[PDB]
Write a protein that holds these residues in place. Structure first.
Motif, PDB file in Angstrom:
ATOM      1  N   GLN A 180      59.530  40.178  16.241  1.00 31.22           N
ATOM      2  CA  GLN A 180      60.404  41.248  15.952  1.00 31.22           C
ATOM      3  C   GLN A 180      60.337  41.743  14.525  1.00 31.22           C
ATOM      4  OE1 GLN A 180      64.718  40.441  16.612  1.00 31.22           O
ATOM      5  NE2 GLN A 180      65.231  42.605  16.302  1.00 31.22           N
ATOM      6  N   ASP A 185      63.953  40.454  25.951  1.00 31.56           N
ATOM      7  CA  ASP A 185      64.411  41.044  24.673  1.00 31.56           C
ATOM      8  C   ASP A 185      63.852  42.445  24.353  1.00 31.56           C
ATOM      9  OD1 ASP A 185      66.169  39.090  24.004  1.00 31.56           O
ATOM     10  OD2 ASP A 185      64.611  37.866  23.052  1.00 31.56           O
ATOM     11  N   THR A 245      71.063  44.015  15.397  1.00 25.22           N
ATOM     12  CA  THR A 245      70.847  43.781  16.833  1.00 25.22           C
ATOM     13  C   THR A 245      71.488  42.478  17.155  1.00 25.22           C
ATOM     14  OG1 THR A 245      68.797  42.712  16.218  1.00 25.22           O
ATOM     15  CG2 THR A 245      68.647  44.934  16.856  1.00 25.22           C
ATOM     16  N   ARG A 289      70.637  40.551  20.730  1.00 20.59           N
ATOM     17  CA  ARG A 289      69.412  39.807  20.708  1.00 20.59           C
ATOM     18  C   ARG A 289      69.444  38.614  19.731  1.00 20.59           C
ATOM     19  NH1 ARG A 289      63.599  41.907  20.149  1.00 20.59           N
ATOM     20  NH2 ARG A 289      62.199  40.075  19.961  1.00 20.59           N
ATOM     21  N   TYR A 340      69.260  32.779  28.058  1.00 23.94           N
ATOM     22  CA  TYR A 340      68.377  33.632  28.791  1.00 23.94           C
ATOM     23  C   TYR A 340      68.494  33.512  30.290  1.00 23.94           C
ATOM     24  CZ  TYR A 340      66.193  35.109  24.431  1.00 23.94           C
ATOM     25  OH  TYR A 340      66.014  35.613  23.167  1.00 23.94           O
ATOM     26  N   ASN A 355      59.745  34.576  18.527  1.00 22.21           N
ATOM     27  CA  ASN A 355      60.567  35.747  18.826  1.00 22.21           C
ATOM     28  C   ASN A 355      60.931  36.487  17.564  1.00 22.21           C
ATOM     29  OD1 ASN A 355      62.897  37.481  19.758  1.00 22.21           O
ATOM     30  ND2 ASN A 355      62.809  36.293  21.665  1.00 22.21           N
ATOM     31  N   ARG A 414      71.116  35.637  21.186  1.00 19.57           N
ATOM     32  CA  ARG A 414      70.369  34.842  22.131  1.00 19.57           C
ATOM     33  C   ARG A 414      69.388  33.891  21.430  1.00 19.57           C
ATOM     34  NH1 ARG A 414      70.647  39.827  25.008  1.00 19.57           N
ATOM     35  NH2 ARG A 414      68.562  40.457  24.242  1.00 19.57           N
TER      36      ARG A 414
END
Length: 164
Positions: free
Chosen positions: A105, A10, A142, A145, A161, A101, A148
């Motif tokens: 971020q 990512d 985004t 990303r 992934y 994740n 996912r």
């Protein structure tokens, strides 16, 4: 697959100072330096983080050390958050990786703000959560990303992934 590999996919890996998708100075594996517009301000925060006069370039090892610190920090921020913790604790191993994740971020603060999606993941309403997660600036800004990650919560598998 694991969290390290997941975020490395990512975030990518850059050895020089760069500007992330929001135009802020970052380096390494998504390691934010400053939200400040000054490249000097960035270079300063970088030397200070690394502990040497870097001149805006670091090594692979140094990037991976900041990465390990960042992941660690994210988990501990989740654990210390009254809103995140209980969600985290109710999730299985794959889904916990999707929560880290997002925290990585956008900060624990940013994440703790998805009140309704949190509730939903906590109740294990996968599909509903996934839809509520997509209604957000995060997803609009985004989308590849966010998708996912959202797939990860929806499915509980690393399918999104594998291939990458």
């Amino acid at each position: 697959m694991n969290i390290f590999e997941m975020l490395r996919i990512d975030e990518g890996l850059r050895l020089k100072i760069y500007k992330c998708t929001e135009g802020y100075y970052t380096i390494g594996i998504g390691h934010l330096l400053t939200k400040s517009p000054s490249l000097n301000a960035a270079k300063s925060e970088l030397d200070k983080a690394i502990g040497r006069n870097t001149n805006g370039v670091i090594t692979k090892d140094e990037a991976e050390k900041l990465f390990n610190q960042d992941v660690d920090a994210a988990v501990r921020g989740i654990l210390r958050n009254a809103k995140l913790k209980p969600v985290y604790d109710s999730l299985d191993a794959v889904r916990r990786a999707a929560l880290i994740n997002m925290v990585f971020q956008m900060g624990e603060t940013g994440v703790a703000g998805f009140t309704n999606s949190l509730r939903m993941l906590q109740q294990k309403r996968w599909d509903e959560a996934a839809v509520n997660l997509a209604k957000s600036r995060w997803y609009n800004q985004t989308p590849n990303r966010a998708k996912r990650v959202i797939t990860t919560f929806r499915t509980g598998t690393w399918d999104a992934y594998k291939n990458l």
